[PDB]
């Protein structure tokens, strides 16, 4: 096959495999960090929500994505578990991708070579080679690769610390029905001495049977993919919860670091949850960075698929939209991260303003219907005319929230109760007769601000955000 179509399948499966690892990481934090901390009674229900935030919703998004990928790929969840049951040193590489990168490494392999998964994936296997390695043996391996055939040799490899060990290595291509090589299987039998006669004859049989089991394990993965963009184009516009999480990931990380230094009983309980072999010895504070990494990873991946997809291909159109949505999703994420002050205010409103009786729960620190990331504009006391009722209003870029006190200082806590249904600014007009008039089509509202300088701040900000909303709605 042409290198273009070859690279195309390589990047399509780069999307699928990395998503598998990612979704797996999300479920880990919920399993061995979230649920334990909630039932540990070490922290309050409020402190826990500051860290994970909407972590649960992040899983619901990607699981919906991963499932769609698996059905198209005719896969099942078994791949990770099936591969883990093979307790041998092995890696899988992708010859379709430049420099033949590693896409998977067994637990035995990682511990043998003293490297971590983050150091390994995406790189060529030549880091094992050293000074006392027979370069003639290496060339035989390269030839077997270029000729797309299996091979079995012995050579000296090095760990991360530089420890020497003999490597009874076996290479084996992974072919589909059409015989096209999709992956390469590399099994390593570590030893102290060069094996001969019976010692060699036994080791060869094991590492070869090991390779066959991997081919069976990766049987669902090896098949080629026709289309993948239509799935990404339908799932990416539903990656909204990332905007909230990534805007609060900084405060969530600062909470962990602070609570650790002021509570020794908390520090030990966290590390006893990072013990789990699925954590690979990385702390909880390192998992929090992953959602921000994944959303910035998507545009890089999709573009690689798009660049290796011709114009006449039916998947080219969907990949265009997918790239657009991925970049739009990524942009709104970076906007929320930068506007830190706006993020603190929206989350403050979330906790102190009780909004109930709605068809859907109100999340202030989220995306609007049309304008994107919600932005707080103005707040203050508002007195309704002819009633003079003490009300407290919150003005946003998309709607106005009226409440009643039962301002943004974290220590100061006071309760706000929702007064009426959120008045959206896509259907309101504002004129002047500290009294100002807003014109809703259905009902009439006449409010009186604290002062003259206040009502001018209301009228201006409401009108400006309204006109921006109206003209945005007129686009389509
Ligand atoms: C699946 C696979 C597994 C490999 N495993 C090893 C290995 O364990 N040790 C090693 O020295 N080379 C291994 N190689 C070979 C190297 O990745 C590399 O291709 C080889 O050393 C030739 O390097 P060169 O391109 O600089 O000539 C493996 C290759 C493949 C495709």
Coordinates of C-alpha atoms and ligand atoms in Angstrom, one line a residue:
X1 CA 0.0 0.0 0.0
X2 CA 1.0 3.6 -0.6
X3 CA 2.7 5.4 2.4
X4 CA -0.2 7.8 2.5
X5 CA -2.9 5.1 3.0
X6 CA -0.4 3.3 5.2
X7 CA 0.1 6.3 7.5
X8 CA -3.7 6.9 7.5
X9 CA -4.4 3.6 9.2
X10 CA -1.6 4.2 11.6
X11 CA -3.0 7.5 12.8
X12 CA -6.6 6.2 12.9
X13 CA -5.4 3.5 15.3
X14 CA -3.3 6.0 17.2
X15 CA -6.6 7.7 18.0
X16 CA -8.3 4.5 19.1
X17 CA -5.4 3.0 21.2
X18 CA -4.5 6.2 23.0
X19 CA -8.2 6.7 23.7
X20 CA -8.3 3.3 25.2
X21 CA -5.5 4.2 27.5
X22 CA -7.0 7.6 28.3
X23 CA -10.5 6.3 29.2
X24 CA -8.8 3.6 31.2
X25 CA -6.9 6.3 33.2
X26 CA -10.1 8.2 33.8
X27 CA -11.8 5.1 35.3
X28 CA -8.8 4.4 37.5
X29 CA -9.0 7.8 39.3
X30 CA -12.7 7.2 39.9
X31 CA -12.1 3.6 41.1
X32 CA -9.1 3.9 43.4
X33 CA -9.0 7.6 44.2
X34 CA -12.5 9.2 44.0
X35 CA -14.6 6.6 45.8
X36 CA -12.0 5.8 48.5
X37 CA -11.6 9.5 49.4
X38 CA -15.3 10.1 49.6
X39 CA -15.8 7.2 52.1
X40 CA -12.6 7.9 54.0
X41 CA -14.3 10.8 55.8
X42 CA -11.0 12.7 55.8
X43 CA -12.4 15.6 53.7
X44 CA -15.8 17.3 53.4
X45 CA -18.1 16.8 50.5
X46 CA -17.2 20.3 49.4
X47 CA -13.4 19.8 49.4
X48 CA -13.7 16.7 47.2
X49 CA -15.8 18.5 44.6
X50 CA -13.1 21.2 44.3
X51 CA -10.5 18.6 43.0
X52 CA -12.4 16.2 40.7
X53 CA -15.1 18.8 39.8
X54 CA -17.0 17.2 36.8
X55 CA -14.6 14.3 36.4
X56 CA -17.6 11.9 36.2
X57 CA -19.0 13.8 33.2
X58 CA -15.6 13.6 31.5
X59 CA -15.9 9.8 31.6
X60 CA -19.4 9.9 30.2
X61 CA -18.2 11.8 27.2
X62 CA -15.2 9.7 26.3
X63 CA -16.9 6.4 27.0
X64 CA -19.6 7.4 24.6
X65 CA -16.7 8.2 22.2
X66 CA -14.7 5.0 22.8
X67 CA -17.8 2.7 22.5
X68 CA -18.6 4.3 19.1
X69 CA -15.0 3.6 18.0
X70 CA -15.1 0.0 19.2
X71 CA -18.3 -0.8 17.3
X72 CA -16.9 0.5 14.1
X73 CA -13.7 -1.4 14.9
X74 CA -15.8 -4.4 15.9
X75 CA -13.8 -4.4 19.1
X76 CA -14.6 -5.4 22.7
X77 CA -13.1 -4.2 26.0
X78 CA -11.2 -7.4 26.2
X79 CA -8.0 -6.2 24.5
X80 CA -6.3 -4.6 27.5
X81 CA -7.2 -7.5 29.7
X82 CA -6.2 -10.1 27.1
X83 CA -2.8 -8.5 26.7
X84 CA -2.3 -8.2 30.4
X85 CA -2.8 -12.0 30.8
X86 CA 0.3 -12.6 28.6
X87 CA 2.9 -12.4 31.4
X88 CA 5.9 -12.0 29.0
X89 CA 8.2 -9.3 27.8
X90 CA 6.9 -7.9 24.6
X91 CA 6.1 -4.7 22.6
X92 CA 4.0 -3.9 19.6
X93 CA 5.2 -1.3 17.0
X94 CA 3.5 0.4 14.1
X95 CA 5.6 0.3 10.8
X96 CA 2.9 2.5 9.2
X97 CA 4.1 5.4 11.4
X98 CA 7.5 7.1 11.0
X99 CA 10.5 5.4 12.7
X100 CA 8.2 2.5 13.6
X101 CA 7.0 3.7 17.1
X102 CA 6.0 1.5 20.0
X103 CA 2.2 1.6 20.6
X104 CA 2.2 -0.9 23.5
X105 CA 4.6 -2.4 26.1
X106 CA 3.9 -5.3 28.5
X107 CA 4.2 -4.9 32.2
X108 CA 7.0 -7.4 32.2
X109 CA 8.8 -5.4 29.6
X110 CA 8.6 -2.1 31.4
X111 CA 9.9 -3.5 34.6
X112 CA 12.7 -5.4 32.8
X113 CA 14.0 -2.3 31.0
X114 CA 13.4 -0.1 34.0
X115 CA 11.5 2.4 31.9
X116 CA 8.0 3.9 32.2
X117 CA 5.2 3.8 29.7
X118 CA 5.4 7.5 29.1
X119 CA 9.1 7.2 28.2
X120 CA 8.5 4.3 25.8
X121 CA 5.4 5.0 23.7
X122 CA 5.9 6.7 20.4
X123 CA 9.7 5.8 20.2
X124 CA 11.8 3.3 18.4
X125 CA 13.1 0.2 20.2
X126 CA 16.7 1.0 19.6
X127 CA 17.2 2.6 23.1
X128 CA 17.8 -0.9 24.4
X129 CA 21.0 -1.2 22.3
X130 CA 24.4 -0.3 23.7
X131 CA 28.2 -0.4 23.1
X132 CA 28.7 -4.1 23.5
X133 CA 25.7 -4.8 21.2
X134 CA 26.6 -6.7 18.0
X135 CA 25.7 -4.3 15.2
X136 CA 25.6 -7.2 12.7
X137 CA 22.8 -8.7 14.7
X138 CA 20.9 -5.4 14.6
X139 CA 21.2 -5.3 10.8
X140 CA 19.5 -8.7 10.5
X141 CA 16.6 -7.4 12.5
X142 CA 16.3 -4.3 10.2
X143 CA 16.4 -6.6 7.1
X144 CA 13.6 -8.7 8.5
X145 CA 11.6 -5.6 9.0
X146 CA 12.2 -4.1 5.6
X147 CA 11.4 -7.5 4.0
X148 CA 8.4 -7.8 6.2
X149 CA 9.3 -11.3 7.6
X150 CA 9.9 -12.9 11.0
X151 CA 13.3 -13.4 12.6
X152 CA 14.9 -14.7 15.8
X153 CA 18.3 -13.6 17.1
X154 CA 20.3 -13.0 20.3
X155 CA 21.9 -9.7 21.3
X156 CA 23.0 -7.5 24.2
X157 CA 20.5 -4.9 25.4
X158 CA 20.7 -2.3 28.2
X159 CA 18.2 -1.1 30.8
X160 CA 17.7 2.5 31.9
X161 CA 20.5 2.3 34.5
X162 CA 22.7 0.5 32.0
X163 CA 22.3 -3.0 33.2
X164 CA 23.5 -5.7 30.7
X165 CA 21.3 -8.7 29.8
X166 CA 21.1 -11.1 26.9
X167 CA 18.1 -10.8 24.6
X168 CA 16.7 -13.8 22.9
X169 CA 14.6 -11.6 20.6
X170 CA 11.9 -12.7 18.2
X171 CA 10.2 -10.5 15.5
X172 CA 6.9 -11.2 13.8
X173 CA 4.7 -9.2 11.5
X174 CA 1.0 -8.8 12.0
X175 CA -1.0 -9.2 8.7
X176 CA -4.7 -8.9 7.9
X177 CA -6.6 -11.0 5.3
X178 CA -5.0 -9.1 2.5
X179 CA -1.6 -9.9 3.9
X180 CA -0.8 -6.2 4.5
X181 CA 1.5 -5.7 7.5
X182 CA -0.2 -3.6 10.2
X183 CA 1.9 -4.2 13.3
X184 CA 5.1 -5.9 14.4
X185 CA 5.4 -8.1 17.4
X186 CA 8.7 -8.2 19.4
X187 CA 9.1 -10.7 22.1
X188 CA 12.2 -10.5 24.4
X189 CA 13.5 -13.4 26.6
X190 CA 16.0 -11.8 29.0
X191 CA 19.0 -13.9 30.1
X192 CA 22.5 -13.6 31.6
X193 CA 24.3 -15.8 29.0
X194 CA 24.1 -16.7 25.4
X195 CA 21.9 -19.8 25.0
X196 CA 22.9 -22.7 22.9
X197 CA 21.6 -26.2 21.9
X198 CA 18.7 -27.2 24.1
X199 CA 18.6 -23.8 26.0
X200 CA 18.2 -22.0 22.7
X201 CA 15.7 -24.5 21.2
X202 CA 13.4 -24.1 24.2
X203 CA 13.5 -20.3 24.4
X204 CA 12.7 -20.0 20.7
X205 CA 9.6 -22.1 21.1
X206 CA 8.3 -20.0 24.0
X207 CA 8.8 -16.6 22.5
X208 CA 7.2 -17.8 19.2
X209 CA 4.2 -19.1 21.0
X210 CA 4.0 -15.9 22.9
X211 CA 4.0 -14.0 19.6
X212 CA 1.1 -16.1 18.4
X213 CA -1.0 -15.3 21.5
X214 CA -0.4 -11.6 21.0
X215 CA -1.5 -11.9 17.4
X216 CA -4.7 -13.6 18.7
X217 CA -5.0 -10.9 21.4
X218 CA -4.6 -8.1 18.9
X219 CA -6.8 -9.8 16.4
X220 CA -9.5 -7.2 16.8
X221 CA -7.0 -4.4 16.5
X222 CA -5.1 -5.5 13.3
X223 CA -8.1 -5.0 10.8
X224 CA -8.0 -1.9 8.6
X225 CA -10.5 1.0 9.1
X226 CA -12.6 2.6 6.3
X227 CA -14.1 5.6 8.1
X228 CA -13.5 7.3 11.5
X229 CA -14.2 11.0 10.9
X230 CA -18.0 10.7 11.0
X231 CA -17.7 9.4 14.6
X232 CA -15.3 12.2 15.7
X233 CA -17.6 14.7 14.0
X234 CA -20.6 13.6 16.1
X235 CA -18.8 13.1 19.5
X236 CA -16.5 16.2 19.7
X237 CA -19.4 18.7 19.9
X238 CA -20.3 16.9 23.1
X239 CA -17.0 17.4 24.8
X240 CA -18.4 20.4 26.7
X241 CA -17.5 19.2 30.3
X242 CA -13.8 19.7 29.5
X243 CA -14.2 23.4 29.5
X244 CA -15.4 23.4 33.1
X245 CA -12.8 20.9 34.4
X246 CA -9.8 22.6 32.7
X247 CA -10.8 26.0 34.1
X248 CA -10.8 24.5 37.6
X249 CA -7.9 22.1 37.3
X250 CA -5.5 24.7 38.6
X251 CA -7.5 25.3 41.8
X252 CA -8.0 21.6 42.1
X253 CA -4.3 21.0 42.0
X254 CA -3.5 23.8 44.5
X255 CA -6.0 22.2 47.0
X256 CA -4.2 18.9 47.0
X257 CA -0.8 20.4 47.6
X258 CA -2.1 22.6 50.4
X259 CA -4.1 19.9 52.2
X260 CA -1.1 17.6 52.1
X261 CA 1.2 20.1 53.9
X262 CA -1.3 20.8 56.6
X263 CA -2.6 17.3 57.2
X264 CA -0.2 14.3 57.6
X265 CA -3.1 11.9 57.9
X266 CA -4.2 12.9 54.4
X267 CA -0.8 12.6 52.7
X268 CA -0.4 8.9 53.7
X269 CA -3.9 7.9 52.6
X270 CA -3.3 9.3 49.1
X271 CA 0.0 7.5 48.5
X272 CA -1.7 4.3 49.8
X273 CA -4.1 4.7 46.9
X274 CA -1.3 5.3 44.4
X275 CA 0.2 1.9 45.4
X276 CA -2.1 0.1 42.9
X277 CA -0.1 -1.4 40.0
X278 CA -2.4 0.3 37.5
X279 CA -1.1 3.6 38.7
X280 CA 2.5 2.6 37.7
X281 CA 3.8 4.6 40.7
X282 CA 2.5 8.1 39.6
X283 CA 0.7 10.3 42.1
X284 CA -3.0 11.5 41.9
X285 CA -1.8 15.1 41.1
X286 CA -0.4 13.7 37.8
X287 CA -3.8 12.2 36.7
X288 CA -5.4 15.7 36.9
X289 CA -3.2 17.0 34.1
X290 CA -4.4 14.3 31.7
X291 CA -7.8 15.8 30.6
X292 CA -6.0 19.0 29.6
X293 CA -3.4 16.9 27.7
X294 CA -6.0 14.9 25.8
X295 CA -8.1 17.8 24.4
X296 CA -4.9 19.4 23.0
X297 CA -3.9 16.0 21.6
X298 CA -7.0 15.6 19.4
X299 CA -6.3 18.3 16.9
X300 CA -2.8 16.8 16.3
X301 CA -4.2 13.4 15.8
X302 CA -7.1 14.3 13.5
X303 CA -4.9 16.5 11.3
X304 CA -2.5 13.6 10.9
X305 CA -5.4 11.4 9.7
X306 CA -6.8 14.3 7.5
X307 CA -3.4 14.9 5.8
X308 CA -3.3 11.2 4.9
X309 CA -6.8 11.2 3.5
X310 CA -7.4 12.1 -0.2
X311 CA -10.1 14.6 -1.4
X312 CA -12.3 12.0 -3.1
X313 CA -12.3 9.8 0.0
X314 CA -15.7 9.8 1.7
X315 CA -14.1 10.3 5.1
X316 CA -12.3 13.5 4.1
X317 CA -15.4 15.7 4.6
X318 CA -16.1 14.4 8.1
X319 CA -12.4 14.8 9.1
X320 CA -12.6 18.5 8.2
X321 CA -15.6 19.0 10.5
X322 CA -13.9 16.9 13.1
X323 CA -10.8 19.1 13.0
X324 CA -12.9 22.2 13.2
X325 CA -14.9 21.0 16.2
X326 CA -11.7 19.7 17.9
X327 CA -10.0 23.1 17.5
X328 CA -13.2 24.9 18.5
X329 CA -13.4 22.6 21.6
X330 CA -9.8 23.2 22.3
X331 CA -10.1 27.0 21.9
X332 CA -13.0 27.3 24.4
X333 CA -10.9 25.2 26.8
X334 CA -8.0 27.6 26.7
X335 CA -10.4 30.6 27.1
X336 CA -11.7 29.2 30.3
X337 CA -8.2 28.6 31.7
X338 CA -7.0 32.1 31.0
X339 CA -10.1 33.9 32.4
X340 CA -9.4 32.7 35.9
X341 CA -11.3 35.4 37.7
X342 CA -14.4 34.7 35.7
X343 CA -14.1 31.0 36.6
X344 CA -13.9 31.6 40.3
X345 CA -17.1 33.8 40.2
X346 CA -19.2 31.3 38.2
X347 CA -18.2 28.5 40.6
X348 CA -18.9 30.7 43.6
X349 CA -22.4 31.3 42.2
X350 CA -22.8 27.6 41.7
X351 CA -22.3 26.8 45.4
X352 CA -24.0 29.8 47.0
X353 CA -27.0 30.2 44.7
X354 CA -29.6 27.4 45.1
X355 CA -31.3 26.8 41.8
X356 CA -34.0 24.1 41.9
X357 CA -37.2 23.3 40.0
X358 CA -35.7 23.4 36.6
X359 CA -35.9 20.8 33.8
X360 CA -32.1 20.6 33.9
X361 CA -29.6 21.4 36.7
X362 CA -28.0 24.8 36.2
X363 CA -24.3 24.8 35.8
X364 CA -23.0 28.4 35.8
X365 CA -19.3 27.5 35.0
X366 CA -20.2 26.0 31.7
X367 CA -21.0 26.7 28.0
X368 CA -23.9 28.9 26.8
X369 CA -26.3 28.0 24.1
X370 CA -24.7 30.2 21.5
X371 CA -22.1 32.5 22.9
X372 CA -19.9 29.7 24.2
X373 CA -18.1 29.9 27.6
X374 CA -20.4 31.7 30.0
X375 CA -19.1 35.0 31.4
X376 CA -20.2 36.8 34.6
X377 CA -20.9 40.5 33.9
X378 CA -22.5 42.3 36.8
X379 CA -24.3 41.8 40.1
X380 CA -26.0 43.9 42.8
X381 CA -29.1 44.7 44.7
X382 CA -32.2 45.2 42.6
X383 CA -35.6 46.5 43.9
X384 CA -38.7 45.7 41.9
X385 CA -40.9 48.8 41.5
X386 CA -44.5 48.7 43.0
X387 CA -43.2 46.0 45.4
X388 CA -39.9 47.2 46.7
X389 CA -38.8 43.6 47.3
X390 CA -35.2 43.0 48.3
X391 CA -33.7 41.0 45.4
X392 CA -30.1 40.2 44.3
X393 CA -29.4 39.9 40.6
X394 CA -26.6 38.1 38.7
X395 CA -26.0 39.3 35.1
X396 CA -24.4 36.9 32.6
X397 CA -23.5 37.1 28.9
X398 CA -26.5 35.0 28.0
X399 CA -29.1 35.5 30.8
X400 CA -29.9 37.4 33.9
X401 CA -30.5 35.6 37.2
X402 CA -32.7 37.1 39.9
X403 CA -32.3 35.8 43.4
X404 CA -33.3 36.7 47.0
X405 CA -30.8 36.9 49.8
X406 CA -31.7 34.6 52.7
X407 CA -19.8 39.1 47.6
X408 CA -17.1 37.0 45.9
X409 CA -15.0 36.5 49.1
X410 CA -14.2 32.7 49.6
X411 CA -14.3 32.8 53.4
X412 CA -17.6 34.8 53.5
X413 CA -20.5 32.4 53.0
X414 CA -24.1 33.5 52.6
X415 CA -27.1 31.9 50.9
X416 CA -28.9 32.9 47.7
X417 CA -32.2 31.4 46.7
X418 CA -33.4 31.5 43.1
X419 CA -36.3 33.9 42.7
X420 CA -37.6 33.3 39.1
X421 CA -36.8 31.6 35.8
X422 CA -33.5 32.8 34.2
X423 CA -34.3 35.7 31.8
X424 CA -32.4 35.1 28.6
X425 CA -31.0 38.2 26.8
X426 CA -32.1 37.0 23.4
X427 CA -35.6 38.5 24.0
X428 CA -35.3 41.7 26.0
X429 CA -35.1 45.4 25.4
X430 CA -33.9 48.1 27.7
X431 CA -34.9 51.8 27.8
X432 CA -34.8 54.7 30.3
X433 CA -37.8 56.5 31.8
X434 CA -32.0 54.6 39.9
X435 CA -34.9 53.1 38.1
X436 CA -34.5 51.4 34.8
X437 CA -36.8 49.4 32.5
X438 CA -36.2 46.0 30.8
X439 CA -38.7 44.8 28.3
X440 CA -39.6 41.2 28.2
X441 CA -42.2 40.2 25.6
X442 CA -44.3 38.1 28.0
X443 CA -44.0 40.1 31.3
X444 CA -42.9 43.6 32.4
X445 CA -40.1 44.2 34.8
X446 CA -39.3 47.5 36.4
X447 CA -36.2 47.4 38.7
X448 CA -34.5 50.1 40.9
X449 CA -30.8 49.9 41.4
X450 CA -28.8 51.1 44.4
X451 CA -27.7 54.3 42.8
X452 CA -27.7 56.2 39.4
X453 CA -24.2 54.9 38.6
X454 CA -25.5 51.4 39.2
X455 CA -28.5 51.5 36.8
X456 CA -26.3 52.8 34.1
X457 CA -24.0 49.8 34.6
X458 CA -27.1 47.5 34.4
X459 CA -28.6 49.1 31.2
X460 CA -25.2 49.2 29.4
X461 CA -24.1 45.7 30.2
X462 CA -27.5 44.1 29.6
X463 CA -28.0 45.9 26.2
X464 CA -24.5 45.2 25.0
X465 CA -24.7 41.5 25.9
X466 CA -28.2 41.3 24.3
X467 CA -27.2 42.8 21.0
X468 CA -24.2 40.5 20.9
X469 CA -26.6 37.6 21.5
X470 CA -29.2 38.7 18.9
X471 CA -26.6 39.2 16.1
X472 CA -25.0 35.8 17.0
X473 CA -28.4 34.1 16.6
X474 CA -28.9 35.8 13.3
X475 CA -25.9 34.0 11.8
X476 CA -28.0 30.9 11.3
Ligands
LIG1 C1 8.3 -5.0 17.3 C2 9.7 -4.7 17.4 C3 10.4 -5.0 18.6 C4 11.8 -4.8 18.7 N1 12.5 -5.1 19.8 C5 13.8 -4.8 19.9 C6 14.5 -5.1 21.1 O1 13.9 -5.6 22.0 N2 15.9 -4.9 21.2 C7 16.5 -4.3 20.1 O2 17.7 -4.1 20.2 N3 15.9 -4.0 18.9 C8 14.5 -4.3 18.8 N4 13.8 -4.0 17.7 C9 14.6 -3.4 16.5 C10 14.7 -1.9 16.6 O3 13.4 -1.3 16.8 C11 15.3 -1.3 15.4 O4 14.4 -1.4 14.3 C12 16.6 -2.0 15.0 O5 17.5 -1.9 16.1 C13 17.2 -1.4 13.7 O6 17.6 -0.1 14.0 P1 18.1 0.9 12.8 O7 16.9 1.4 12.1 O8 18.9 2.0 13.4 O9 19.0 0.1 11.9 C14 12.5 -4.2 17.6 C15 11.8 -3.9 16.4 C16 10.4 -4.2 16.3 C17 9.7 -3.8 15.0

